Enzyme design. Structure first.
Site: not given
Ligand SMILES: Nc1c(-c2nnn[nH]2)cnn1-c1ccc(Cl)cc1Cl
Ligand SMILES: Nc1c(-c2nnn[nH]2)cnn1-c1ccc(Cl)cc1Cl
Length: 263
Positions: A45, A212
């Protein structure tokens, strides 16, 4: 001069089990610290900064572009869409999509920015236009986060991303109003308190974009305004050998703390 900081980063990396990439620019004097600065890492991201910035560049010749509505349909929702899901069967403006992508890491919003630029290659073309020969965006959300070791897709290097982030937020890659808008958005990020910010003195002001993905990939790119000195730009990229590895935001905080203790 940076051997001591580099050795501390190497010790952190060794204890982490993964691969760490760091690039600092101190804008007072353009001095730098690099650790694996020319190795490629999956952006995840953190690539949302380049997409939002490219739309800001388009807005320099279209005063109403950021107010332009974009339709959100049920089929547009991807894997994490905390803002866009509220607007399904409705619209969001390009400003709203930019804010959602940057401040909430909304993945549907990122896809709308990519589409506004003509696809992933339009984001790469903007990167080239502002002097970044390293950045490449190849895919949309969610597949841009596969983060497979050795895969060049959707990667950059710490050195290149720090230079680009500097030019976008503190330099003149964007017009003045657009630069200020990007800085405002980054300073309003909701997702960053456990990453670079956690390793810095609490009084310093930070704007950042986290990322991530698979392989435990955990990233943060930040502009930092310490008290009493010119701003810094800091990139911390981290990726691990196992596809299902857990996120390690603490490693990014530890890298930032090593950097801060070396100033
Ligand atoms: N973890 C992240 C990020 C993120 N941005 N910055 N760090 N990580 C952006 N999208 N996702 C994400 C992907 C899949 C699911 Cl189920 C939930 C999430 Cl929140
Ligand atoms: N990069 C440099 C130089 C330098 N002089 N000439 N070219 N570079 C001097 N100090 N540093 C430095 C900057 C930040 C941190 Cl955390 C640690 C260090 Cl040692």
């Amino acid at each position: 001069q940076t051997s001591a900081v580099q050795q501390k980063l190497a010790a952190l990396e060794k204890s982490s089990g993964g691969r760490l990439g760091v690039a600092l620019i101190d804008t007072a004097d353009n001095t730098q610290v690099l650790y694996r600065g020319d190795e490629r890492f999956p952006m995840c991201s953190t690539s949302k900064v380049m997409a939002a910035a490219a739309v800001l560049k388009q807005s320099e010749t279209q005063k109403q572009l950021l107010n332009q509505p974009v339709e959100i349909k049920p089929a547009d929702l991807v894997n994490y869409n905390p803002i866009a899901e509220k607007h399904v069967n409705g619209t969001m403006t390009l400003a709203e999509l930019s804010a959602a992508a940057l401040q909430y890491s909304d993945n549907t919003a990122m896809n709308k920015l990519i589409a506004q630029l003509g696809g992933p290659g339009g984001v790469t073309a903007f990167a080239r236009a502002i002097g970044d020969e390293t950045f490449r965006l190849d895919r949309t959300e969610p597949t841009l986060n596969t983060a497979i070791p050795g895969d060049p897709r959707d990667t950059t290097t710490p050195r290149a991303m720090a230079q680009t982030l500097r030019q976008l937020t503190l330099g003149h890659a964007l017009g003045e109003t657009q630069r200020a808008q990007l800085v405002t958005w980054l300073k309003g990020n909701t997702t960053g308190a456990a990453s670079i910010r956690a390793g810095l003195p609490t009084s310093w002001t930070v704007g950042d974009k986290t990322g991530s993905g698979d392989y435990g990939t955990t990233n943060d790119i930040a502009v930092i305004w310490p008290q009493g000195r010119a701003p810094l730009v800091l990139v911390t990229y981290f990726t691990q050998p196992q596809q299902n590895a857990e996120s390690r935001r603490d490693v990014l905080a530890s890298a930032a703390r090593i950097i801060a203790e070396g100033l």
